[PDB]
Amino acid sequence: MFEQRVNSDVLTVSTVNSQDQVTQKPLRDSVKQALKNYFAQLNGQDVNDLYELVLAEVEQPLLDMVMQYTRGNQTRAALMMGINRGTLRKKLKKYGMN
Template sequence: MTPKPIDACVRENLEAYFQDLDGEEPHSMHDMLIKLVERPLLEVVMQKAQGNQSKAAEWLGINRNTLRRKLTEHQML
């Protein structure tokens, strides 16, 4: 079985989110979605980089200090 593309999974989940809201207006969706996606991204990249923050930061295309800040925000240090 071929996995769905990430954007298709996000789209499906957003549709379900709006359906669950049942007419209520959403708030702070961008922040919510970034936090939900960022943590598993960091977890997988850090695992594949065997905990090497410099390598992980390079793979992510971000500064090592930014990576450390994000790891701290997600309580992953």
């Protein structure tokens, strides 16, 4: 009665395919393509912050959406994110969203 939804089809993105059909692909792939383009535009320059970079690039929308969803309620936001409320307030401060 219940079809398996793979972890990878939970957070998905609308894409256009070789037959100009709209399909949902994993967010993984967005991250992969972004990273491939980032790597492609390096030309052997040295990197030391890739994790923080991606992490910021991903934490910011997450907080944005979860704050919109809870209508500013940090406790609920923290509770649905699965993190301590203080950690959440910290992150919110980090991205100037309080």
